[PDB]
Protein: Cytochrome P450 121 CYP121
Organism: Mycobacterium tuberculosis
Amino acid sequence: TVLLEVPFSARGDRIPDAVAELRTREPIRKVRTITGAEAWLVSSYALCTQVLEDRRFSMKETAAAGAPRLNALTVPPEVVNNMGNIADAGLRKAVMKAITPKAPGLEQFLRDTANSLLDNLITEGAPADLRNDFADPLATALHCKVLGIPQEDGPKLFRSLSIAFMSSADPIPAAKINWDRDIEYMAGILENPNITTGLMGELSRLRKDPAYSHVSDELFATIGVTFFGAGVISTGSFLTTALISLIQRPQLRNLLHEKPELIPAGVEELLRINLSFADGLPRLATADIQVGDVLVRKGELVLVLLEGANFDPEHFPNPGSIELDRPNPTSHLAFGRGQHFCPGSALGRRHAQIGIEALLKKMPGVDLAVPIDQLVWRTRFQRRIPERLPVLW
Ligand code: HEM
Ligand SMILES: Oc1ccc(-c2n[nH]c(NCc3c[nH]cn3)c2-c2ccc(O)cc2)cc1
Ligand SMILES: Oc1ccc(-c2n[nH]c(NCc3c[nH]cn3)c2-c2ccc(O)cc2)cc1
């Protein structure tokens, strides 16, 4: 027998029985990644939070030359430190303000786009693909709006993502090609006088502001590419697997349809049980640090298994069930924790809440149109998603 390998399963509709067993017996244990490197897999809520809240477990240094790797880089090394670069350039507050869902028109844009997507589906008739023809276009449309770039440009940028967020043992030639092309697109956007709204609009004017004159010009285009990619792949994938969890629970579906004011509470539970992250979050130990029964050594790789924490019965009793009245409802790790907590968390919540609200209104009888085992789960990818999500209503 060989050392236990990660990831365990590409299926995003059920957590393996093995996670519970692992968490109970060995909440931190050694595993092998797809590159052949060894790593510590952390799977209890307590130890996951300890790692995420201790900056000596570094995200930046996972990109160091010769480090044990979860997967191959699909960005330049320094872009792993993207938020650190943004903060050092003085751009953190501006980036945050631009990607809030409280921007005027934004919530109405989401509703209009979702409703328009659903009407098209209805007109075509069942079956409909809720991933390719609903959740992902909605994510793509949203991030075009958030960035301030043409809606028409969305599908072209989206096409990079099935490779850009691969979880590969080896570097990917196509990833570099798409990167260079997408970076050039965003640089053009910065020079485009028509682009005055959203994130790219704000970055364009900060670029001409004397207070930012010494900010690297390549960081501006990089922010656009990375926030579009991360936002679209994360919201599209989350909404998709959230719709599966909802569909699998007709009474919850009915309840939220009847009482839509419960939808935010519903989405928060759907976030907690969400299996969209295919791998643990990687960190490199920059010191010798005790984690449970293991002294992690400087230079070693640690993987924070989000569903390990989020299904931990010591923190979330009956973790497999959706409870709209938990006393600790946002304390899940779906958005991470600590220094690198997701900057798009508000946008991600609203994308899901509005998508679900529109869906339940337009398709109250929504149900899977194929047996659940017929869903095709994407492999070697940083997210777990079904290639198609056929439904009827
Ligand atoms: C439901 C939707 C989303 C989920 C589940 C999600 C999940 C996460 C998680 C778990 C992390 C932490 C990664 C780590 O600590 O290693 C993260 C970070 C990040 N997220 Fe999200 N995210 C979502 C939406 C978004 C959106 C809408 C954006 C931007 C528009 C975004 C951009 C980012 C960026 C740039 C980081 C890196 C933060 C850093 O390095 O400090 N995400 N996300
Ligand atoms: O056009 C794009 C947009 C995004 C990525 C991307 N792919 N994978 C990751 N994640 C870290 C990673 C893992 N393996 C290799 N890179 C990112 C990313 C996300 C956000 C961020 O701030 C910094 C990088 C790639 C191409
Ligand atoms: O298993 C591993 C992990 C990482 C490296 C590594 N390669 N290049 C660097 N260079 C940055 C660097 C900063 N200070 C001293 N090295 C490091 C490294 C080491 C330890 C550390 O705490 C932070 C980074 C090598 C093997």
